[PDB]
Every structure is written in C-alpha cells, then in structure tokens.
Amino acid sequence: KVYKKASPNGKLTTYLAKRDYYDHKEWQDNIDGVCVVKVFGLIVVAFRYGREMGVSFRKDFAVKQMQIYPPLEENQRPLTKLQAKLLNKLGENAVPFHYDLPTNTPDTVCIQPAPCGVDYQVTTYVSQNMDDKIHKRNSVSLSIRKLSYFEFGSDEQPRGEISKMKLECTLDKARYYSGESMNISVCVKRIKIQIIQLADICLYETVTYKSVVTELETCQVYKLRPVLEVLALNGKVKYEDTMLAASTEVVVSYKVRIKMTDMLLEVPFKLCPARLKGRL
Ligand SMILES: [Cl-]
C-alpha cells in the first residue's frame, strides 16, 4: 500500500509507509515518508477518558517535532527505498521526512463503553515557527497505530495447582498471538473455564475493568478462542482489523479462571498481537 492524505488547502500531501508501526524493544518501525509542498512535523499522542455529569479528561502532547522543509542537514537521514521510489514518482519539490518511533509512550488502545484510550497521529503543517498555530487548512493528519511486539522472554507453561481433591491445570502455550486458540489440560459436577481481560485505566480516574472474553461450561481438556469475534481493543472499532489489545509490558492483561463445582484457580498468560510476516 501507500498511505496518503492531502490537506483541505490542497497545497501539501503526506505519504506514509504503512499505518501500524510496531515496537520490537530492540528496534522499531520508524516513520519514513515523504512530504510535498516553512514546513513542520510532529506526532500528537492523545489520551482521552470519558466524553464531553461524570469526568471528561483529554490530554494531547507533541512527542517528536521537526522542521521538514527545508531539510535541515541535522535531521537529514538515510532515505528508505519506499522513500527512494516515491521521490522518483514525484517531483524535486518532494521532501523525505523521518521520525523515530516513540517508544516509552503507551501502545494504541481503545476501550469501548467510560470510553477511553490512546491515539497517535502524524501531522505536517506550514508555518513561520515551530510553536506557531496549527491551522486546519495547511495541516495534514493521518492516524497511525503504534503497537508493541514483545516476543523474547519465556518462563513457559501456564499451570496452577491447588488442593482442598487436587487440581493441577496446565495451559497449552505460554504466550499466544491474536487469532490463536487455547487448550487447558484440567488434570484434576461442573467445569467453568473463563478467559478474563483486566484493563487498569490510570487516566485521572483510576479504574479496573475485569471482562470475560470467552468461556465454556460442561483428566479432561477443553478449548477456547481468546479472539473478538467470539473491552480493551488495539484500535478503533470501525476498523475491522481491530483486535484485542495485547498484554502491556491503560494496562491490559489476561488470565484463565477455572471453577469446578467449589475449587478455584486463576492462571496468567501473555497475549501478543497477531503474528506477522512483515518483521523489518
Ligand atoms: Cl485504529
């Protein structure tokens, strides 16, 4: 793909590699696009909690901030190939920009309804100062999605033992990627298997939402799909790509809860985003 938005004024279009940029801890999908006309750029990070008689809390702040044009030789950086190819599809009045992906800011997250979440945007604008007013005509804004792809780190095999009758319950796979299924060897009337998402908002009001993803009621072994076609989301609900919002490293986490009629057992496991084939 190519990710393009033009301005309401028309006088500048911005192009982006893709829309979802993943932090890998040791390196990250930085932002290497091209601008076409001074001209400035930044990344807004939005924190919203509630909508406009409870509690509205909106907080925006600019994290990277940049003169794009003319390219100051300090911010000058290696041109990506996509940048290299785009700069040939268009004129010499096309300028390549780059932003370091902003790690040590929180992953995109969007709790549906207290509505709540974190958002990201690339914004490039004309001005005669970096802290001058950012109007709507000379601005462009493209929503991006910033996510954390943290794989390395084992301590594998979820399992919880307990004994009033003894109950050892192991789980297939220690981390699971969005889309994957869950198996649960309950090697001990009823059995209740529950995947709960915890989301702890700390956006002013400090709230803890516990939320039931999937469940069955019926040595034995049972299966569950910790997916969304079956809540903290990695995205806005209008995007059919939006999935469940993946264990933080808003704080999201997951846990299995086995109740047998009463013996009781709650077992953690990490949830990573949906495995890709476009790493670096
Ligand atoms: Cl989104």
Q: Any residues with CB less than 8 A from the CB of 53 and at least 6 apart, and which? A: none
Q: Are 152 and 224 in contact (CB under 8 A)?
A: no
| β partners of residue 57 | 49
Output phi, psi for 87, to 5 deg. Answer: -60, -15
CA atoms in the 13 A half-sphere facing the CB of 55: 11
Q: How far is the CA of 46 from the centre of ligand 1 (A)?
A: 13
Resolution in units of Å: 3.0
Q: Length of the chain in residues, anyone?
A: 280
Question: In angstroms, rounded to a whole number, what is the distance separating the alpha carbons of residues 80 and 132?
Answer: 30
By what technique were these coordinates determined?
X-ray
Q: Any residues with CB less than 8 A from the CB of 84 and at least 6 apart, and which? A: none
Question: In angstroms, rounded to a whole number, what is the distance separating the alpha carbons of residues 96 and 14?
Answer: 10
Nearest-CA neighbor of 208 among 197, 218, 219?
197
Output phi, psi for 112, to 5 deg. Answer: -75, 160
Question: In angstroms, rounded to a whole number, what is the distance separating the alpha carbons of residues 56 and 48?
Answer: 8
Q: How far is the CA of 239 from the centre of ligand 1 (A)?
A: 6
Question: In angstroms, rounded to a whole number, what is the distance separating the alpha carbons of residues 245 and 106?
Answer: 12
What the block records as the tokens of 105 is 């800011």
- What's the order of all strands across the beta sheet hosting 159-160? 159-160, 168-171, 182-187, 220-224
Q: How far is the CA of 242 from the centre of ligand 1 (A)?
A: 7
Q: How far is the CA of 241 from the centre of ligand 1 (A)?
A: 8
- 81's enclosing H/E stretch is helix 81-89
Question: In angstroms, rounded to a whole number, what is the distance separating the alpha carbons of residues 55 and 85?
Answer: 48
Residue type, 169: C
Rounded (to 5) percent helix, strand, coil in the chain: 5, 50, 45
Question: In angstroms, rounded to a whole number, what is the distance separating the alpha carbons of residues 131 and 271?
Answer: 40
Question: In angstroms, rounded to a whole number, what is the distance separating the alpha carbons of residues 89 and 83?
Answer: 10
Q: How many CB atoms lie within 10 A of CB 165?
A: 8
For β-strands 168-171 and 159-160, DSSP reports them as antiparallel
Q: How far is the CA of 133 from the centre of ligand 1 (A)?
A: 27
Q: How far is the CA of 170 from the centre of ligand 1 (A)?
A: 34
Question: In angstroms, rounded to a whole number, what is the distance separating the alpha carbons of residues 38 and 22?
Answer: 30
Q: How far is the CA of 254 from the centre of ligand 1 (A)?
A: 21
The C-alpha angle 39, 40, 44, rounded to 5 degrees, equals 150
Q: How far is the CA of 263 from the centre of ligand 1 (A)?
A: 40
Q: Is the dihedral of CA 155, 159, 164, 165 positive or negative?
A: negative
Q: How far is the CA of 83 from the centre of ligand 1 (A)?
A: 24
Q: How far is the CA of 146 from the centre of ligand 1 (A)?
A: 9
